[PDB]
Paper text:
Formation of active HIV-1 reverse transcriptase (RT) proceeds via a structural maturation process that involves subdomain rearrangements and formation of an asymmetric p66/p66′ homodimer. The viral RNA codes for a p66 protein that forms an asymmetric homodimer in which the RNase H domain in one subunit becomes destabilized, leading to subsequent unfolding and proteolysis in order to form the active p66/p51 heterodimer.
The globular fingers, palm, and connection subdomains of FPC1 overlay well with those of both the p51 subunit of RT and the p51 monomer. Similar structural agreements were obtained using the FPC2 structure.
Author numbering: 6 to 65, 69 to 87, 95 to 136, 139 to 214, 224 to 240, 318 to 356, 362 to 417
The structure:
């Protein structure tokens, strides 16, 4: 059985142009998509489908596909965050996005997930999803019940570990001694493999220590500003009303966009840990300079919204 999904009343699906990619990124995307197609997760389509969402490829040997569903997400219907996560000595971020590929996507909604692998030449290759896609806000919401069953035996044996999922990421928090924390993360990886997950980047662990980090309305949106200082030094604030800050910080570095891009990722990760939401950024940089370079330094599996200022 599949979950029926609608766009928000009054909205059509996304029609976002694919941006130019290097020959190397295209090659990688073609191999990834060929295998997804073989595996039935996507299907080729033609120009009868008017929708489109951008795709590119990142490196964290192996490229990873990254579909920029920011517009589709804004257009999709609406469907818990642990307060203790930010309190844990260590939080390790795992990538598990391959998990969504086992659940079919409402046949009526598939057309809206269309994307285009550009070509060096010709228009390029168009596909749409048949299965819950990575990066789409409905996929965790539909899969939520199944991931609870998968995690439940592990949570039962480890009641003091906090596990929180945001999109493709699992955030796993413990107060254990660092060696023991890391060994428990491997135990969780192996638990997931025994339940069928085979995510190619699961082996990596991105390690946070939020207890060492520096009035919130869930309905409200989080906003982040960033200011360039100097010699690789940036400052930021997260708020909801410009005066009433919820967090402030500094990131320290090479070029600016690369540093700004790392700062944006770091700030978003903190927001996800603290509140479970990505903020909307006000970026101190020119649109065209940002757009030329940010994908060269992006390593996250999500993408926040941004504006330029």
């Amino acid at each position: 059985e599949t979950v029926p999904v609608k766009l928000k009343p009054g909205m059509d699906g996304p029609k976002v142009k694919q941006w130019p990619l290097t020959e190397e990124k295209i090659k990688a995307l073609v191999e990834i998509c060929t295998e997804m197609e073989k595996e039935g997760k996507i299907s080729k389509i033609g120009p009868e489908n008017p929708y489109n969402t951008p795709v590119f490829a990142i490196k964290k040997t192996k490229w990873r596909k990254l579909v920029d569903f920011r517009e589709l997400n804004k257009r999709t219907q609406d469907f818990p965050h642990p307060a203790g996560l930010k309190k844990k000595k260590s939080v390790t971020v795992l990538d598990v996005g391959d998990a969504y590929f086992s659940v079919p996507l409402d046949e009526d909604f598939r057309k809206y997930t269309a994307f285009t692998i550009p070509s060096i030449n010709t228009p390029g290759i168009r596909y749409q999803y048949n299965v819950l896609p990575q990066g789409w806000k409905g996929s965790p919401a539909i899969f939520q019940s199944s991931m609870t069953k998968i995690l439940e035996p592990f949570k039962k044996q480890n009641p003091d570990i906090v596990i929180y999922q945001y999109m493709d990421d699992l955030y796993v928090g413990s107060d254990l001694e660092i060696g023991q924390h890391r060994t428990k993360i491997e135990e969780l990886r192996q638990h997931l493999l025994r339940w069928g997950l085979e995510p190619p980047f699961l082996w990596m662990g991105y390690e946070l220590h939020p207890d060492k980090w520096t009035g919130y309305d869930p309905s409200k949106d989080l906003i982040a500003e960033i200011q360039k200082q100097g010699q690789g030094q940036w400052t930021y604030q997260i708020y909801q009303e410009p005066s009433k800050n919820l967090k402030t910080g500094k990131y320290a570095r090479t070029n600016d966009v690369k540093q700004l891009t790392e700062a944006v990722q770091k700030i978003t990760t903190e927001s996800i840990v603290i509140w479970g939401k990505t903020p909307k950024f006000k970026l101190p940089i020119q649109k065209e300079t940002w757009e030329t370079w940010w994908t060269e330094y992006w390593q996250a599996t999500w993408i926040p919204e941004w504006e330029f200022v």
